[PDB]
Design an enzyme around this catalytic site. Structure first.
Site, mmCIF file in Angstrom:
data_model
loop_
_atom_site.group_PDB
_atom_site.id
_atom_site.type_symbol
_atom_site.label_atom_id
_atom_site.label_comp_id
_atom_site.label_asym_id
_atom_site.label_seq_id
_atom_site.Cartn_x
_atom_site.Cartn_y
_atom_site.Cartn_z
ATOM 1 N N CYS A 108 93.391 85.669 75.685
ATOM 2 C CA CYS A 108 92.087 84.478 76.890
ATOM 3 C C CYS A 108 91.202 84.919 78.357
ATOM 4 O O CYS A 108 91.582 86.117 78.364
ATOM 5 C CB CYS A 108 93.236 84.198 78.386
ATOM 6 S SG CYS A 108 92.225 82.923 79.631
ATOM 7 N N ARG A 111 90.418 84.808 82.023
ATOM 8 C CA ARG A 111 91.464 85.605 83.356
ATOM 9 C C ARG A 111 90.949 86.471 84.400
ATOM 10 O O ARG A 111 92.045 86.931 85.395
ATOM 11 C CB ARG A 111 92.640 86.775 82.348
ATOM 12 C CG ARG A 111 93.254 86.307 81.379
ATOM 13 C CD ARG A 111 94.195 87.316 80.922
ATOM 14 N NE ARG A 111 92.950 87.707 79.546
ATOM 15 C CZ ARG A 111 93.981 89.212 78.808
ATOM 16 N NH1 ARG A 111 94.621 89.691 79.768
ATOM 17 N NH2 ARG A 111 92.758 89.556 78.308
ATOM 18 N N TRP A 280 89.504 75.276 82.573
ATOM 19 C CA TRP A 280 88.124 73.924 82.383
ATOM 20 C C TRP A 280 87.433 75.488 81.505
ATOM 21 O O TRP A 280 88.256 75.802 80.782
ATOM 22 C CB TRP A 280 87.262 74.214 83.878
ATOM 23 C CG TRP A 280 87.176 75.552 84.098
ATOM 24 C CD1 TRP A 280 86.155 76.629 83.755
ATOM 25 C CD2 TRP A 280 87.336 76.556 85.343
ATOM 26 N NE1 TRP A 280 86.136 77.801 84.679
ATOM 27 C CE2 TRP A 280 86.774 77.082 85.921
ATOM 28 C CE3 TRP A 280 88.412 75.783 86.422
ATOM 29 C CZ2 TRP A 280 86.996 78.389 86.985
ATOM 30 C CZ3 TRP A 280 88.213 76.678 87.226
ATOM 31 C CH2 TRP A 280 88.059 77.646 87.396
ATOM 32 N N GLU A 285 84.077 76.259 73.124
ATOM 33 C CA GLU A 285 84.745 75.533 72.622
ATOM 34 C C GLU A 285 84.574 74.249 72.031
ATOM 35 O O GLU A 285 85.378 73.821 71.148
ATOM 36 C CB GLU A 285 86.676 75.076 73.679
ATOM 37 C CG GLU A 285 86.617 76.944 74.293
ATOM 38 C CD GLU A 285 87.782 76.982 75.428
ATOM 39 O OE1 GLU A 285 89.093 76.180 74.853
ATOM 40 O OE2 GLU A 285 86.904 76.871 76.917
HETATM 41 C C1 HEM Z 1 90.533 79.182 84.300
HETATM 42 C C2 HEM Z 1 89.368 78.766 82.812
HETATM 43 C C3 HEM Z 1 89.958 79.431 82.023
HETATM 44 C C4 HEM Z 1 88.962 79.423 80.367
HETATM 45 C C5 HEM Z 1 87.646 79.333 80.561
HETATM 46 C C6 HEM Z 1 89.769 80.175 79.392
HETATM 47 C C7 HEM Z 1 89.743 80.288 78.513
HETATM 48 C C8 HEM Z 1 89.852 80.029 77.018
HETATM 49 C C9 HEM Z 1 89.416 80.309 76.008
HETATM 50 C C10 HEM Z 1 88.275 79.891 75.471
HETATM 51 C C11 HEM Z 1 90.327 80.552 75.138
HETATM 52 C C12 HEM Z 1 90.421 80.944 73.418
HETATM 53 C C13 HEM Z 1 90.985 79.318 73.401
HETATM 54 C C14 HEM Z 1 90.611 78.961 72.013
HETATM 55 O O1 HEM Z 1 89.628 79.483 70.739
HETATM 56 O O2 HEM Z 1 91.774 78.145 71.624
HETATM 57 C C15 HEM Z 1 92.095 81.320 75.851
HETATM 58 C C16 HEM Z 1 93.389 80.736 75.372
HETATM 59 C C17 HEM Z 1 93.673 80.991 76.405
HETATM 60 N N1 HEM Z 1 94.350 80.731 77.679
HETATM 61 FE FE1 HEM Z 1 92.823 80.704 78.910
HETATM 62 N N2 HEM Z 1 90.858 80.040 80.230
HETATM 63 C C18 HEM Z 1 91.095 79.187 80.887
HETATM 64 C C19 HEM Z 1 92.370 79.401 81.428
HETATM 65 C C20 HEM Z 1 93.932 79.692 81.698
HETATM 66 C C21 HEM Z 1 95.037 79.066 82.376
HETATM 67 C C22 HEM Z 1 95.257 78.594 83.845
HETATM 68 C C23 HEM Z 1 96.236 79.546 81.516
HETATM 69 C C24 HEM Z 1 97.609 79.530 82.049
HETATM 70 C C25 HEM Z 1 97.813 79.706 82.984
HETATM 71 C C26 HEM Z 1 95.014 80.110 79.956
HETATM 72 C C27 HEM Z 1 96.008 80.452 79.355
HETATM 73 C C28 HEM Z 1 95.275 81.311 77.972
HETATM 74 C C29 HEM Z 1 96.685 81.300 76.423
HETATM 75 C C30 HEM Z 1 98.159 81.310 76.692
HETATM 76 C C31 HEM Z 1 96.023 81.877 75.466
HETATM 77 C C32 HEM Z 1 95.590 81.496 74.195
HETATM 78 C C33 HEM Z 1 95.860 80.266 73.613
HETATM 79 C C34 HEM Z 1 96.759 80.545 72.187
HETATM 80 O O3 HEM Z 1 96.667 81.591 72.011
HETATM 81 O O4 HEM Z 1 96.079 79.743 72.103
HETATM 82 N N3 HEM Z 1 93.930 79.932 80.073
HETATM 83 N N4 HEM Z 1 91.049 80.462 77.108
HETATM 84 C C1 LIG Z 2 94.045 76.107 79.824
HETATM 85 C C2 LIG Z 2 93.206 76.483 78.910
HETATM 86 C C3 LIG Z 2 91.703 76.949 79.001
HETATM 87 C C4 LIG Z 2 90.655 76.977 78.564
HETATM 88 N N1 LIG Z 2 89.085 76.633 78.834
HETATM 89 N N2 LIG Z 2 91.141 76.464 76.581
HETATM 90 C C5 LIG Z 2 92.482 76.148 76.392
HETATM 91 C C6 LIG Z 2 92.690 75.986 75.134
HETATM 92 C C7 LIG Z 2 92.602 75.014 74.663
HETATM 93 C C8 LIG Z 2 91.389 74.181 74.937
HETATM 94 N N3 LIG Z 2 90.240 74.533 73.536
HETATM 95 C C9 LIG Z 2 91.136 74.586 72.540
HETATM 96 C C10 LIG Z 2 92.500 74.734 72.740
HETATM 97 O O1 LIG Z 2 93.295 75.263 72.464
HETATM 98 C C11 LIG Z 2 94.005 75.048 71.846
HETATM 99 C C12 LIG Z 2 95.132 76.287 70.873
HETATM 100 N N4 LIG Z 2 94.533 77.291 70.595
HETATM 101 C C13 LIG Z 2 93.844 77.461 69.448
HETATM 102 C C14 LIG Z 2 94.886 77.324 68.001
HETATM 103 C C15 LIG Z 2 96.666 78.458 68.012
HETATM 104 C C16 LIG Z 2 98.112 78.225 67.462
HETATM 105 C C17 LIG Z 2 97.268 77.997 66.504
HETATM 106 C C18 LIG Z 2 96.095 76.975 66.179
HETATM 107 C C19 LIG Z 2 95.020 76.510 66.275
HETATM 108 O O2 LIG Z 2 93.998 76.502 67.258
HETATM 109 C C20 LIG Z 2 92.958 76.253 77.379
#
Ligand code: HEM
Ligand SMILES: Cc1cc(N)nc(C[C@H]2CNC[C@H]2OCCNCc2ccccc2O)c1
Ligand code: HEM
Ligand SMILES: Cc1cc(N)nc(C[C@H]2CNC[C@H]2OCCNCc2ccccc2O)c1
Ligand SMILES: C[C@H](O)[C@H](O)[C@H]1CNc2nc(N)[nH]c(=O)c2N1
Ligand SMILES: C[C@H](O)[C@H](O)[C@H]1CNc2nc(N)[nH]c(=O)c2N1
Ligand SMILES: [Zn+2]
Lengths: 411, 407
Positions: A108, A111, A280, A285
């Site tokens: 993420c 963070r 947000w 993305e």
């Molecule tokens: C506040 C604005 C936030 C932004 C701009 C942001 C940005 C991102 C982005 C760009 C990704 C990659 C997603 C992807 O490529 O599929 C991500 C992944 C992730 N974020 Fe955030 N995030 C935010 C908030 C949060 C929040 C509130 C949480 C949980 C409390 C969170 C937890 C995670 C987790 C667990 C992943 C990995 C997801 C996965 O492996 O599919 N994020 N974040």
């Molecule tokens: C809380 C939060 C904020 C943010 N900006 N983006 C996200 C991630 C969301 C919005 N854009 C991509 C989506 O994530 C989907 C889950 N991740 C991709 C993924 C993980 C495991 C396996 C296959 C996948 O495509 C979460």
């Protein structure tokens, strides 16, 4: 031990000691690196150490380590485990734990915001209608008419693994995908299988390119139930371009609220299988991945067509050109409508400041480079040049299998 | 122990078995992934020699043959007697092609079997090294129709008689720190330029001065040489649509030629082994031109395009980046100097991976290096899981010689 990371742009060298608190495995060995692999019922026996480690972390954070309240809480949890085989988190511990799962989420980039998370405790929930209501409140609170606020909603933990709460949707808001007899896809190809499940469960599909999917919610190991999110609660942004007036006629829009609903929150050995969370968007993305992945909306060709780019050779960089314009369009559109969004230059610069602060105050910040570097313009962002250490801390968010693969259908 | 990799765009799943032949260590453990870190006796040599000769005799379908057993014995005798051994020409060629084949950070490996190997093991002086290197440069350049090559100087002995090319690449541009405080030329080469001048270089003090070769033979002090300018093919950079582009006065050289690495074959170490291929466009347009710590030209270009540089969110950096990279490719293509774009190179690498999986059981690959530094997710390598591990023969990093060499 001490590990060092270097930034190759600034020569700033950081020292990691926090990796010494890593418990879980990476998938890597001395002989293989699995850094680019996407995806690499507990006993009392395994549970008490996990509880203890967590409560030691919670009590240090509040500067009460080894206090009477710390000691009483250990004893209390100990007793609850032997007698009931599980235990309940205090509200304060649940909040701390959910904030830490985010703080520890190495994939993420967002963070910097970890300590500002609204936690909705939904552990008194018992039915899918109850879940629907909780999830509506979360969506309305988080959306906040465009001024987005990070939030998480936490449903009851796993007990015997037969009574799981799950949100079957992968994100709370996503668009339907429909595979046509001719092999083409209407709407979002990522969501075909799930759309098909919803239809089988009784959803009446409008069959358009941007149909917000129904929620499919499972309470207490019961069969999942369909609900439509009130459309007045689903904030959307029509996509237009600041210079290109034909861009609007591509018919594109996206939702404002990114809200991951399929992950598992682990806190102190407890497993919260339904814990939708939202923030947000970073513009890429949507503009890079949702729009331009070949297996998603795949709009590169139609855009470059309309820009009259030379499409006969890849070396014209027509794809790269169309890609930038689309991402301009997405950020322009969200900003014009006053819906929160961050560009990839801002988000990555903020992440680097977060990571540096975390090294000073925490002794580290686990980070997955493969995920943190944005999917366009990588090396003109400061994260590209930053060495990162990826390791696993708890509390944590984890993948779990898709519920249609494991669910025991009742009828 | 059998490992799977998936492409998330195409759902293609490949099974890797080649990793179980992995020799060296990654830097990673079960607790910590170091995937994004840049730099993570008689007794020892026979296992390494045997490992190598076994794979060699296997490759020519002669595994377990008398000629195999005879070579193993001959090498064994030579190590016990001389404390090292010498490779047959066939072994040297196979070893060098395989070091490239094993280079997990290289996107261009579909080419690995077309490598011209220049055997320079008979070289004894820096002047001789200079001769060998000019011949390599000319052969590889081939009037713009580039051909991959490597030149292999004598192997390490007692480690006090090392052959080294002090240059990081055969062809690079000087860097000078100014009274102004800014940097003229390429900021990466400031220190190396300050080693050259210190040994006597006639620095012209311009923005694009081809550095001199600084060559070390047999552990001796290194000497300076200028590459004949007509052997250094350079390309003026212009844009197909923006006329003002030429006015930045940008140029780059046609021949990318890494010269600071160590080739390991069968436990033998070739500390001077300059090799070359041709550029992928982004190396120059994204990295050389746009890195903040390099030529860093984004601001100047964005200005001439009259973009809004007040806010990061107008994506002015991204817009300029694409144009700068369009210009690099157009210029090389117009002057008929071989270059590949990142779309073409990464598509070829996917084809290569599938070949290696099918015919060899895998392909070590470092995703962090293989995915281009711009437009990552629109190239197929972005969506391809890769396993990274170390096979020998290999190219390895080695200390910069100025820290090691005693004068
Ligand atoms: C506040 C604005 C936030 C932004 C701009 C942001 C940005 C991102 C982005 C760009 C990704 C990659 C997603 C992807 O490529 O599929 C991500 C992944 C992730 N974020 Fe955030 N995030 C935010 C908030 C949060 C929040 C509130 C949480 C949980 C409390 C969170 C937890 C995670 C987790 C667990 C992943 C990995 C997801 C996965 O492996 O599919 N994020 N974040
Ligand atoms: C809380 C939060 C904020 C943010 N900006 N983006 C996200 C991630 C969301 C919005 N854009 C991509 C989506 O994530 C989907 C889950 N991740 C991709 C993924 C993980 C495991 C396996 C296959 C996948 O495509 C979460
Ligand atoms: C034929 C055209 C070739 C192309 C298009 C190509 C492509 C590339 C690229 C883009 C990189 C990353 C460089 C960087 O970002 O610094 C690289 C690295 C590398 N290549 Fe190639 N390559 C080619 C030929 C060769 C040859 C001929 C060899 C050796 C015989 C080779 C061995 C290596 C090695 C060892 C690395 C990693 C170097 C390092 O760690 O700095 N490549 N390749
Ligand atoms: C044989 C070949 C071909 C090709 N197209 N590119 C290359 C790589 C060359 C051209 N661009 C960068 C250069 O390699 C420089 C060394 N690699 C990066 C690196 C490694 C270790 C430490 C610092 C570094 O900057 C080699
Ligand atoms: C194979 C590879 O790990 C996979 O495509 C990853 C690469 N990096 C990513 N980075 C982000 N942020 N999101 C992703 O889905 C991916 N996909
Ligand atoms: C810290 C990080 O590993 C470093 O910036 C890397 C990232 N990926 C790279 N990829 C390539 N091809 N070349 C590089 O120089 C780098 N630099
Ligand atoms: Zn690793």
């Amino acid at each position: 031990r001490f590990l060092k990371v270097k930034n190759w742009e600034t020569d700033v060298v950081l020292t990691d000691t926090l990796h010494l608190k890593s418990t879980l495995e990476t998938g890597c060995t001395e002989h293989i690196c699995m850094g680019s692999i996407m995806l690499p019922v507990r006993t009392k026996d395994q549970l008490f150490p996990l509880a203890k480690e967590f409560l030691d972390q919670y009590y240090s954070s509040i500067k009460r380590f080894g206090s009477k309240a710390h000691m009483d809480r250990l004893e209390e949890v100990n007793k609850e485990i032997e007698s009931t085989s599980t235990y309940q988190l205090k509200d304060t511990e649940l909040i701390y734990g959910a904030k830490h799962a985010w703080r520890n989420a190495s994939r993420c980039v967002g963070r910097i915001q970890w300590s500002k998370l609204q936690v909705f405790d939904a552990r008194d929930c018992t039915t899918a209608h109850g879940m629907f209501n909780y999830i509506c409140n979360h969506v309305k609170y988080a959306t906040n008419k465009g001024n987005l606020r990070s939030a998480i909603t936490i449903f009851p933990q796993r007990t015997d693994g037969k009574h799981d709460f799950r949100v079957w949707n992968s994100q709370l808001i996503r668009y339907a995908g429909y595979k046509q007899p001719d092999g083409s896809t209407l709407g979002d190809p990522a969501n075909v299988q799930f759309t098909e499940i919803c239809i089988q469960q009784g959803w009446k599909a409008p069959r358009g390119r941007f149909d917000v999917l129904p929620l499919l919610l499972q309470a207490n190991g019961n069969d999942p139930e369909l609900f439509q999110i009130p459309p007045e609660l689903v904030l959307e942004v029509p996509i237009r371009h600041p210079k290109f007036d034909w861009f609007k006629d591509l018919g594109l829009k996206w939702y404002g609220l990114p809200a991951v609903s399929n992950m598992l929150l682990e806190i102190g050995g407890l497993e919260f299988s339904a814990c939708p969370f939202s923030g947000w968007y970073m513009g890429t993305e949507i503009g890079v991945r949702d729009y331009c992945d070949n297996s998603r909306y795949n709009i590169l060709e139609e855009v470059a067509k309309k820009m009259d780019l030379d499409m006969r050779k890849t070396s014209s960089l027509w794809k790269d050109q169309a890609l930038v314009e689309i991402n301009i369009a997405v950020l322009y559109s969200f900003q014009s409508d006053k819906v929160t969004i961050v560009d990839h230059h801002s988000a990555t610069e903020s992440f680097i400041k977060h990571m540096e602060n975390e090294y000073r105050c925490r002794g580290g910040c686990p980070a997955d480079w493969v995920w943190i570097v944005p999917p366009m313009s990588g090396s003109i962002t400061p994260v590209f040049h930053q060495e990162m250490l990826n390791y696993r801390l708890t509390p944590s968010f984890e993948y779990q299998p898709d519920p249609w693969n494991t669910h025991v259908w009742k009828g």
